C-alpha cells in the first residue's frame with residue numbers, strides 16, 4: 046500500500062497510522078485523525094511543512110521542544126513524531142498527539158454552557174496556564190479553537206506554535222499578561238456564545254475594546270507606546286465604559302468580577318493566573334494542592350531567531366531523532 050494521502054496532500058504516516066480523516070489545517074500544515082494500530086486507538090496527527098521559511102522553522106522547533114518538556118493534564122502532549130530518514134528527504138514533520146473529541150469553538154457554536162460548565166472550563170484553562178507560565182513560557186494564541194475537549198469535559202490547551210519563553214489579542218500588542226487577556230475574551234465568549242471584541246482589523250479591534258471598557262485613562266494611555274496608535278486613540282471622541290452586568294445580564298456576578306479583572310486595559314493591573322485561580326468564582330474547583338507547576342523555568346540555550354533556516358532544519362532533524370527506529 047502506497048504512501049497515504051488526504052485531500053490531494055501526502056500524509057505519509059503508515060503503516061502504523063491509517064484510516065485517516067481530515068480535521069483541520071494551519072498556516073503551513075494539516076491535522077488529521079488516524080488509527081494507531083499499535084495502541085489500537087485513534088490519535089491526532091499534525092503535519093507541518095515549515096522548511097521554506099525561517100520563521101516557521103523557528104516556531105516548529107520551539108513547539109516541539111516546549112511540548113516535549115511539558116507534562117500536564119490540561120496541555121496537549123506529543124506522543125510520537127514522524128519525519129524522513131534523512132535531512133535531504135525531510136520536507137514535513139508529523140506530530141502525533143492525543144485525539145480530542147471537539148474544541149470550545151465548536152462547542153460554543155452549538156451549545157449553551159451552564160454556569161457550572163463555564164466555571165469548570167475556565168478553571169481548567171487557568172490550571173493549564175499556571176503550569177505554562179510557571180515554566181516561563183507564553184502561549185500567545187489562546188482562543189476557543191485551541192482549547193480541546195474530550196467527551197468527559199476534560200480540557201486541553203493545544204497549538205504551541207506561537208509559544209515563546211485578532212479577536213483575542215491584548216491591547217498591548219497593538220508578557221504573561223497577554224495570555225490572561227485572551228482568557229478573559231474566552232470567558233466572555235463562554236458567557237454569551239459570541240466573541241466580545243470581533244474587530245475586522247487593527248484599528249477596529251481597538252474601537253471595539255474601547256466601546257466596552259471606555260476611553261483609556263492617561264496612565265492607561267502610556268501603555269500604548271506606538272506613536273501612530275497613541276495619536277489615533279487621542280483622535281477618538283470620548284467613550285463611556287459599559288458595565289459588565291449590562292453586557293452579560295444573566296451572568297454570575299462572581300464571573301463578571303473576574304472577567305473585569307482579566308479584561309483590564311493596563312497589563313500591569315490585570316489579574317495574574319494564580320490570583321485568578323484563587324478568585325471566588327472558581328472556589329468550587331480551586332485546589333492549590335493539585336495545581337502543579339513546572340519543576341524549573343524553560344530556557345533556550347540557542348537564540349533561534351538568529352539562525353539560518355538550514356541550521357534550524359538540522360536542529361529539527363536532531364530534535365526528532367529520538368522517535369526514530371533504533372535510535
Ligand SMILES: O=C1c2cc(-c3ccnc(N[C@H]4CC[C@@H](O)C4)n3)cn2CCCN1[C@H](CO)c1cccc(Cl)c1
Nearest residue numbers: 070071072073074075076089143144145146147148204
Ligand atoms: O495544532 C493545531 C491543532 C491540533 C488540534 C487537535 C489535536 C488533537 N485532537 C484534536 N481534535 C480535533 C477533532 C475535531 C476538532 O474540533 C478537535 N485536535 C487542533 N488544533 C487546532 C487547529 C490546528 N492546529 C494548528 C493551527 O491552530 C496547526 C495545525 C497544523 C499545522 C500548523 Cl502550522 C498549525
